[PDB]
């Protein structure tokens, strides 16, 4: 299963020019396009090697649509101020995300569409892709406008159509990179903090995709007390990192085991010191 | 591909 996402962000700046607009395009775990409103190019810029195969006609259409998005979301902010009766000299953030998920067959699986204003949900498309969910009364005014127009089936036509149709093209063009999984590299360290207490930190590096499960077990029993786990973090080269640490008494390190589960590993590895 | 977008 693979997915594609599109994220947009509009940040208002009173007196500092037009609001900053940043839009990015994401495959399941790989960014491939970008657009910055303050950049000199003012064009949809590629951020992946395989996406450069697209012809100039592709970039002309993509640039025109995203630039239309910035103007639409700039006009959107002024409407949001009067809808909520806010100060015209204040700064706010407008967010948006929607994409499509495909299956092993390349079949349509799920569709999403959500807007957000100042970190809270504003309007969202339901799972049926033909009805809306207004979070507050202000969004119901927009919902009424988006119900007078048949916006539901246009996004549904895109989500089941152009989104999926273009996603298979993106995967096929760069199957050498996106469709393959890099297995994690696993090792363990040792860090004593006193004469009878030590910290065992299980390391997993260079995996793709980023979804991975690390479980520290003691004598076959999972442990959460005295365990520190950090969120998955990107390496910048297309891989991700994650470690889990546990403080153990000295002389009992051989009892503890580390288990790492990942898609790239056919069998979940077991690591013991 | 980038989708269409509508105002409020």
């Amino acid at each position, epitope marked *: 299963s693979h997915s594609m996402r599109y994220f947009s962000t509009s940040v208002s700046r009173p007196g500092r020019g037009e609001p900053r607009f940043i839009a990015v395009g994401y495959v399941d775990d790989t960014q491939f396009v970008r657009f910055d409103s303050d950049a000199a190019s003012q064009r949809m810029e590629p951020r992946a090697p395989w996406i450069e195969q697209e012809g*100039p006609e592709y970039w002309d*259409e993509e640039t025109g*649509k995203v*630039k239309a998005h910035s103007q639409t979301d700039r006009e959107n902010l002024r409407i949001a101020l009067r809808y909520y009766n806010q100060s015209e000299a204040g700064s706010h953030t407008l967010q948006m995300m929607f994409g499509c998920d495909v299956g092993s067959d390349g079949r349509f699986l799920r569709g999403y569409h959500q807007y957000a204003y100042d970190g809270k949900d504003y309007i969202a498309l339901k799972e049926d892709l033909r009805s809306w969910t207004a979070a507050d009364m202000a969004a119901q005014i927009t919902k009424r*406008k988006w119900e007078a127009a048949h916006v539901a089936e*246009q996004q549904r036509a895109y989500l*089941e159509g*152009t989104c999926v149709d273009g996603l298979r093209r993106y995967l096929e063009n760069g199957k050498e990179t996106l469709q393959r999984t890099d297995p994690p590299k696993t090792h363990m360290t040792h860090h004593p903090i006193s004469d009878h207490e030590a910290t065992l930190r299980c390391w997993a590096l260079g995996f793709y995709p980023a979804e991975i499960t690390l479980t520290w077990q003691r004598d076959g029993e999972d442990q959460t007390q005295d365990t520190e786990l950090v969120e998955t973090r990107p390496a910048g080269d297309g891989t991700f990192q994650k470690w889990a640490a546990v403080v153990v008494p000295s002389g009992e390190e051989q009892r503890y085991t580390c288990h790492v589960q990942h898609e790239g590993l056919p069998k979940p590895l077991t690591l013991r010191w | 591909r980038y989708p269409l977008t*509508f105002g409020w």
Partner: T-cell receptor
Amino acid sequence: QSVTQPDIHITVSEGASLELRCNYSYGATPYLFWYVQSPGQGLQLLLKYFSGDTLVQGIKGFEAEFKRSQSSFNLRKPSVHWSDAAEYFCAVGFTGGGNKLTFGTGTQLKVEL
Amino acid sequence: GVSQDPRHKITKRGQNVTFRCDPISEHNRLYWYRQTLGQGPEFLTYFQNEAQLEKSRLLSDRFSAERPKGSFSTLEIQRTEQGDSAMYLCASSDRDRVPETQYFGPGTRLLVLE
């Protein structure tokens, strides 16, 4: 892309059934339009469909039916008038590739009495 | 409902021409098309109320289109050649109607002569 109008020229007698076809590229759910253009002035919108409802009634007695299984949006008129002699274009909007319209090859129609 | 100006224009090759379009009120989008003699219209460029979003990459930089105040649009073509003789169409839409209907004006037919 690749909007195709098979009927490139039709000349019929007044009062006969009329059908002008229009096809798209087998995979889109696009905006559909039909425009008429007299030799002098510009285009006048007749019908539009994206909507939901297969069969659409437009101006000047023209009606169109959408068949997704066939990917066809064919103009129809029960009885053609003598004044309908003009070029008929069907316009499509491929929503994925922008909201610009992709016009057809054009059908030149004449009606004799 | 869209109004254009002028309807017919005759100019010599290698000079400057300029056309103006007055679309419907409260419509925020404007499309430019070029229709040759007895052929389908060709897309040129389109705006959303403030700026040029997309241009037909085939048409060179000498084709200048602008919608400064978001109400009327101007099209300027420099170094005219006989291959540019065609009808130029102006269309406007709402961007808030899902069918996204574009309404065209009477158009401007251009004749370029040596």
